[PDB]
Amino acid sequence: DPERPALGILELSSYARGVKVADAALKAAPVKLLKCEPVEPGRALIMLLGEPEDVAKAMIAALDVAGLGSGNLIDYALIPEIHPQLLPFLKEYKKSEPIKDPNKAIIVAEVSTVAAAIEAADVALRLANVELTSMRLAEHIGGRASFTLIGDKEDVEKAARAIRGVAGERLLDLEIIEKPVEALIGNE
Amino acid sequence: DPERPALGILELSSYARGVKVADAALKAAPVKLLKCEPVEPGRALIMLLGEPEDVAKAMIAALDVAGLGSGNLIDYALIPEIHPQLLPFLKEYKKSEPIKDPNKAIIVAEVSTVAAAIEAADVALRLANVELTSMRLAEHIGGRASFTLIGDKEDVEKAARAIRGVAGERLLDLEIIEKPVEALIGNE
Amino acid sequence: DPERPALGILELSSYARGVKVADAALKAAPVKLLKCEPVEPGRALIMLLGEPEDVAKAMIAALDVAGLGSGNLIDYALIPEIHPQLLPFLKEYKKSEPIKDPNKAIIVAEVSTVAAAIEAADVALRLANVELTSMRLAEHIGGRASFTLIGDKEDVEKAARAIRGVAGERLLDLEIIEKPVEALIGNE
Amino acid sequence: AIIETTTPTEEEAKAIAKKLLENRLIAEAIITPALTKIYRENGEIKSETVTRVTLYTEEENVPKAVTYIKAIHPDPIPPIIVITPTDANPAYKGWVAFET
Amino acid sequence: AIIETTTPTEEEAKAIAKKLLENRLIAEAIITPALTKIYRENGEIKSETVTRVTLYTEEENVPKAVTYIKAIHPDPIPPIIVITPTDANPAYKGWVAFET
Amino acid sequence: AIIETTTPTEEEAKAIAKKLLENRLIAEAIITPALTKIYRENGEIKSETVTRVTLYTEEENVPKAVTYIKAIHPDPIPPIIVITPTDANPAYKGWVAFET
Amino acid sequence: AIIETTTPTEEEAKAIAKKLLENRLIAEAIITPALTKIYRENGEIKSETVTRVTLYTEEENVPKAVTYIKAIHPDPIPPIIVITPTDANPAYKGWVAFET
Amino acid sequence: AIIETTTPTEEEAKAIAKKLLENRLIAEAIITPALTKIYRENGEIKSETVTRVTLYTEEENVPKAVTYIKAIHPDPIPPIIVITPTDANPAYKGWVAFET
Amino acid sequence: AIIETTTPTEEEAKAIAKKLLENRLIAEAIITPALTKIYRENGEIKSETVTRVTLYTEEENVPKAVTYIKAIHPDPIPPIIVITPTDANPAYKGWVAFET
Amino acid sequence: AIIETTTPTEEEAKAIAKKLLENRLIAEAIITPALTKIYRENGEIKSETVTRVTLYTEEENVPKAVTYIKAIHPDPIPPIIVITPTDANPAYKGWVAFET
Amino acid sequence: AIIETTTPTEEEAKAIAKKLLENRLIAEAIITPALTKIYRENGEIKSETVTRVTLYTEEENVPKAVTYIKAIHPDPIPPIIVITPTDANPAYKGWVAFET
Amino acid sequence: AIIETTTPTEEEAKAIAKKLLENRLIAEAIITPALTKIYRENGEIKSETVTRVTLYTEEENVPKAVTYIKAIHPDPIPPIIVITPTDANPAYKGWVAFET
Incomplete structure (x- = not known):
């Protein structure tokens, strides 16, 4: 390739x-x-x-x-x-690195098929200034998939509009967290 | 702590x-x-x-x-x-020790939420003379949880009344086994 | 034994x-x-x-x-x-060996209970000239089970009739693949 | 479930509670002394002293407990009332079942 | 049915009960004196003495009785609460209907 | 909604009520001292003194209030019971919502 | 499925079974010789010797097998009867499907 | 419809069949002699010789035929069993109806 | 319920019946010797001698009886078939239940 | 969603598109010049030159966009038509939502 | 409703539109000249020039208009396609109905 | 079914159409050159030249055709839109099916 x-x-x-x-x-x-x-x-x-x-x-x-x-x-x-940025998460299992800045926000998304998850993340990385930190596909789950992105507050706001557009009716949940506590990074 | x-x-x-x-x-x-x-x-x-x-x-x-x-x-x-007795089973994964006596009975319970399981076991250990041997939460299961206790026959009978009181409609199954065979201990 | x-x-x-x-x-x-x-x-x-x-x-x-x-x-x-041939797959976990011939066909079956899977495979090995390569029971699955056999084209055809007879209404899917590509063996 | 009734003296109230505990029909009882009751007798309004008793038990024991109270109460027409709570601490429900 | 409220003094509680009995809206009343109430006034926590009243009547008399209590109560916003029992001695229900 | 519990002393009962008022989880509380409790310990029947507490709040605050009481109660298995009234003076419901 | 019929001689019964096996319409057959049949002819009761044949096959083959038997049977009105079992050893059903 | 029973001797089996034919309750009968039966008597296992009888009739005649067999059978508790076929040659059903 | 199977010799058939009677899984058995079976082996048609066995039991005993027969049968794939009758003499059903 | 209209000159078409983009009501526009229109005026058939405009937006923006176009269009009765597609590339729908 | 088709020359397209207007079957037409069409003839890929026509009318006139176009079109198998819009300016729908 | 997209040059549009015809995924294509597109880049409004392509095919071929277009299109996020007509000349639908 x-x-x-x-x-x-x-x-x-x-x-x-x-x-x-x-x-x-x-x-x-x-x-x-x-x-x-x-x-x-x-x-x-x-x-x-x-x-x-x-x-x-x-x-x-x-x-x-x-x-x-x-x-x-x-x-x-x-x-x-x-x-x-997406290729490493697909070839192997990856983990969450220490988050250098404490001023960044995060966004968490849940969708109903694997196709929706990969396509939505690809478009958001293309159009907005954000970074990918985790991606979890269905393993004994039953089809549900999820992923997480990090960036500045107004950039994360733009990425949310793009994700809703791509996923359509396949979107299940979406949340934005400002100034997350440290343990959420470590537990991730 | x-x-x-x-x-x-x-x-x-x-x-x-x-x-x-x-x-x-x-x-x-x-x-x-x-x-x-x-x-x-x-x-x-x-x-x-x-x-x-x-x-x-x-x-x-x-x-x-x-x-x-x-x-x-x-x-x-x-x-x-x-x-x-409950704390070791929550911090780490534990196993079943050899059962010294062959004259003790056992009781096995199944409930629909994790909250019901922890609360019911805590009350039974408080009021009756029994011992805790295994606790299994939902892992790819779908919410079901279960646990097992051991003691003398009349003490196990009292613990069963307490468990029914705490769990209410969240209880799914409950069985008492007198003089269990050895392999059930080892397979556990 | x-x-x-x-x-x-x-x-x-x-x-x-x-x-x-x-x-x-x-x-x-x-x-x-x-x-x-x-x-x-x-x-x-x-x-x-x-x-x-x-x-x-x-x-x-x-x-x-x-x-x-x-x-x-x-x-x-x-x-x-x-x-x-069935005993090794039950006592331990086994894997798929390299397939020496490239001219053999394969058959893949899916059934709804473990009892149907074991009985159907036993009868097919008894009556037809085929070999068993994989058997997968329900693990966090929900009851579904499957297995795979290999042999010459007309022998695989006879085994399919026997499998339908044993399974009855418990059969979910059944497919025959002629001349499968190499990667399917390795991915198995 | 909660069952309530009243008696003319404090001594009579304690006697009812002890009988119900010995038969394992209730788990505990609370007694409130020195209250005033107002009602009408012979077209006249009068007042007198009373004591109240409250009893705590399980729902499946209610018909047995009410029947026993009727048999031993000192008044000719005893007032007996049952109230069903909408929620309770689950650990306490375990203790109540263990005691009865 | 059971109706509950509170008043600042014992004298006021007895007066309410007598008025309701003369109009044949209730069958009897129980009075509990010398309790303590805790609440917040002007962003400050204070405590004071109160008396409780409990009234026993029939279900079809409830709207009339609540209306009359509101008209004669001494506090500007009186607390009035209604509780419906799940069971009762049938002979006592007969006596309550006979009296009202 | 009405929440009821008991404590061994009058001082402990007042402390629970003050904590709940400071967190704006209830509107007011009533305290009833010097009652008698009868129950069984070690196969023996005994009696002791207790105090009762009653708390008044809104339906949507009930899960928060019960959780807080469990954390600060002095007994190892505290009895906590919830009762839902069938009717109330609408002006009083307005005052309760205004205070919480 | 099970199909039953009768013939006058043992030789005729074997011939029917062989024809059905060569066309792969059944899996096996059982033959019971030297029985007695009793019935009425011309208003008179008579008796004679017969042989019985039982055939085992799959449910989806039944219409074809019955049609073929009617064409080759020696009697002018042959009795042919079909019975459906409620259960069977699953391994045997596999063998029957393999053979047809 | 098919009706089955057993008797101790061949002579008794023929007598039952003749009586049913004279009353026009069945169309024909088949008799199978010299079988072995195994069962338990007085806590002991024993074996003896028996004969089997099979009878062919129409569905609407079944209650009458079973009643008559019970009246004339030689054993104190006769085994009588009824089986309903799922299919049959239509010409043979015509002959059976013509004969009864 | 009726269960049917076949064996190569008469001796083997009697042994199966005795084992089932000692475990109280059936009430009685009938044995039919010296029949002929026709089927295909290695693309060739052959014939051989067989014996038939019929067993009578209650509906709730069927899964246990079929399991036991599979364990002790002499053939590698034994044919076992179950038939459900549509009617029976009620006195005989009483005897069958009494014996098992 | 797709919105279509026509104007007499190319300059007027560009002005409409720019106004809609500045208010963030659409994502992009396509302009097709130098077409011919045929229709009837005063009972006579005539022909003239026109320009077409096509606009691409999200479904939830349609009522706002149509209202704005009506206010600024140069013709007394402007033709405005809306078409709903049955499918689209999901990545392109993401870009459209990002731009508006 | 919108109807679309294509013709080889601009002159032929104008002639179709004029005929439909004289019969009062449509309200107006738009003509787009000098496009390129690509397709396969005799297993070979070729390209040629075409003109497009778009017609605007009411829903109840569609079957009549399609029938007339088929009769006068110059190609042996004419492509004719109908599209239904989801929304439109209500004043424009009034003008279309007034003209037809 | 109708599929629409745009490209920067006329040459690129013809290349897409030829590839789809060789794979027998569409029946014909129409190309419209020299249009103007208006949109926003880097917070600024700009305009440029584009070409439009329209493709005609059967409903059951739509998922295959859209997938192939995405793989060979020159833009990073290609706009692809599908429209379903409400009616068509039946003879033309026959020709479209014959060609694919």
Whole structure:
């Protein structure tokens, strides 16, 4: 992969259907598989990485097999150029560093699908002057996902408008905390 | 903390609302935070430790923020002096020791919230001559909790009446086993 | 245990009722206990191993206590002689070896109870020329289970008919993949 | 549940409470002496001294306790009243169940 | 039904009870003297002596009785509270209806 | 809403009431001294002196007030009971809301 | 599912079973020889020897199997009856599906 | 509908069938001789020889046929069992109705 | 309820019945010897001798009885089938319950 | 949401767009010049030159934007039309919300 | 309602609009010349010049207008598409109804 | 279904259309050059030239077509909008399905 790859995402309600979908995608184009895991309860999550047009060919083949219209497909997305801050949180598990400033605010968001979470965070990092500190996907959870950003008060205000626009009806909760106490950083 | 601290408990249905509630509590009084974790499915659990009046001031501030009446608050409790046998099971994970006597009976209880479980066990240890052997909170479970006590047959009978009184409608199951086989101790 | 033991399986909806059932079974006959664990959400799973008639006496006592008819018992089964390929996957956790041939097909199945999964796999190994590669029971899942077999194309076709016969209404999904890509083996 | 009644003297009130405790029908009792009662007798208004008794128990024991009080009360038509609280400290409900 | 209120002196409490009995709006009354009340006046905490009155009547008489008490009470904003019991001795309910 | 509890001495009862008033969780309190309590200890029946406290507040303040009382009460298992009235003088409800 | 019929001789019964097995419509058959049948012909009661056949198959194969039996049976009006069991060993249902 | 029972000898089985045919309550009967029965008598396990009888009739005749069998059976508590088939050749149902 | 299965020899069939009677899981059994079975092995049609067993019990005993039969049967995949009758002589149902 | 209208000259179209952007009621605008309009005036068919304007905004801003356009448009009866799309790129909806 | 179609030349587009206005089926039309169309003919990709026409009318006139356009269009399979707006200036809807 | 987007140059617009036709995801495309766009950058209002593209396809092809456009578009956040018509000439819908 080059410095800047593209990412495709598919979410399905059956582990067996997921295995079939992943096989078709990998035969259509030279992409690399990141995730094919079962998801609570009895669901599946597939992530693909590669060149933009190669990822597009793979997703076209997957959408045919998945039965788009039969109720087996929950959500999907394609991101043409993934933001550099997001890649470390996806390849491995990361943690929260000490927060140098005490004057920054934070924002916490909860959404109903993995596709909504990744796309919303990517757009907010692109348009506003903020930083990403944690991202937690569904693990025995049941589809819920969440992430956290930090910045100055008026910048965090702008990012909130963008997040509401991207998520739409998939947004569950959103809160802004001014001047958080230290322990919240450490407990994170 | 002194030899004998107090404990406060709050259970919420959203991880983001939980972060906000914990921030208000820690700003109101000098207490120490034990748990702020997400709970299956997409819930949150907060535990506070400190002096009795300090814990009271913290819980007052938390109840204002939590929206007591809006359906975000599931349960809560305050325990003025936590029993000495209970503290080891909360600070760390513990296990079941070999059971010296073969003539003792056991009782197993299942309840629907964490607040009910801690309060019921505390009262039973206070009033009856029994011992605590295991306590298991909700971890990917969905709110269910359980615990186990051991003692002589007539003492275990008295403890059962107290447990029913404390739990009320939050009690799900309760069983008494006379002369249990060895493997149940080891498998525990 | 001899080279060839028998296996009994019981699935219950309450951890406390499960402890009571296991105690009665172990007092009735000299069998060995494999599993007594809580199951998502708040359920329990019991597995017994031993001689065929000894296992039968234990299951008779368990069925009396479990309240067969009161809605506490979800499913059960007895297998008189467990297939040799199945035993390693039950005693310990196993993994997928490299797949020597590239010309073999695979089949993936999903069912609603643990009893259905073990019985269906045992019969398929008995009647058709196939091999077992993975078996995954419910862990924080909620009852769903799955397994995977490999063989030549027409042999896999015969095994599918047997699986549908055993599972009945407990079958959720079933797929056959011809000539799977390499990464599916490695990701497994 | 809370049960209330009145008697003419303090001695009679204590005797009722002791009988109910020995039969394990209640957990505890509170006694309030030296009150004044005003009512009408023979078309005339009069006043006299009384004592009040309050008893604390579990909801499932109420029919048994009321029946026993009626049998041993000194007045020909005893006033007996039951009140159901809307909330209580859960630890105290545990103690009440343990005692009865 | 049970109606409760408080007054500054014992004499005032007896006068209220007598007026309600003469109009046949209640059956009897109980008076509890020499209590202490604590509250805030002008941003300051103070304490004073009070007397309590409890009145027993039928459910269909409640709106009339509350209206009359408001008209004759000595305080500018009188506290008046109504409690509904969940059970009672049936013979006593007969006596209460006979008296009103 | 009405909240009731008991304490061993009159001094302890006044201290609880003052703390609740300073935090603006209640509007006023009434104290009743020198009562008798009867109960069972170690399989034996005994009696002792107690004091009663009654507190008046708004329905939306109840969970906060009960939590604070539990933290400062002198007994190991304090009895705390809540009663909901069926009716009240509307002017008095206005005063209670104004004070809290 | 279970299908039952009768024939006059043992040889005819075996021939029916073999034809159904070659077409893969059933999994196995059981044959019971040398029974007695009693019925009425021309207003007279008579008796004769018969043989019984029982066939085991899957529910979705029933309409095809009944149609084929009607075409090859030796009697002018053949008795054919279908019974549905309420339960069965799950391993045996797997074997039956594998064979058909 | 199918009705089943057993008798100690072959002769007794034929007699039951003939009586039912003369009253036009059934259409035909099948008799299976020389079987073995195992059961418990006086806390002991014993075995003996029996004969089985199977009878074929219409659904609306079942209550009459069962009543008649009970009256003429040789055992003190006769076992009589009824089974309802899920399907049958329509031409055979026509013959059964024609005969009864 | 009625349970049916088959075995290769008459001796094996009697042994199964005796074990079930000693555990009080059934009331009686009937044994039918010397039948013929036809099926397919290795793509070839073959025939062999078998014996049939029929067992009579109560509905609430069915899961226990099926489990025990599976444990002691001589064949690797035993055929076991359950049939539910639509009616029966009430006196006989009384005897069956008395025996188990 | 998409809002469309027309004006007689290109200059007038640009002026409308600038006013709406300064008030933060829309995110962007597209202008299409030199079209032909055909309609009827005084019972006669005539043709003239026009310019089209298309505006992109959020659904919750629509009533405010339409009101402002009506106030500043140069024609006596301005045509204003609103269209609701069935789908859109989610990243673009984020940008539109960020800009308004 | 809005109706859209395309034609090969500007002259043909004006002729369609004039015919619809003379029959009073529409209120006005807008014409957009000199666009490019890309599509596939005989397995080959080609491009050519086209003109677009947009027509504005009332909802109850739509079936009549579409029928007339089909009869006079120059292409063998004409593309005709209808779009329904979600909102409009009420004064403009009045003018449209007045003109048709 | 109708899909709309914009690009900075005419050459880029033609390239997008050709790629979609070769993959058989659309039936035809229309291109409109030399328009003006007005929006805000860095708190300043600016204007620039753009080209518009319109694509015609079937409803079941929409998710595939939108995904492919996102992958090859030249702008960092491309505007892509979908509109669903309420009616169309049935012969034209036949041609569109035949071509894809």
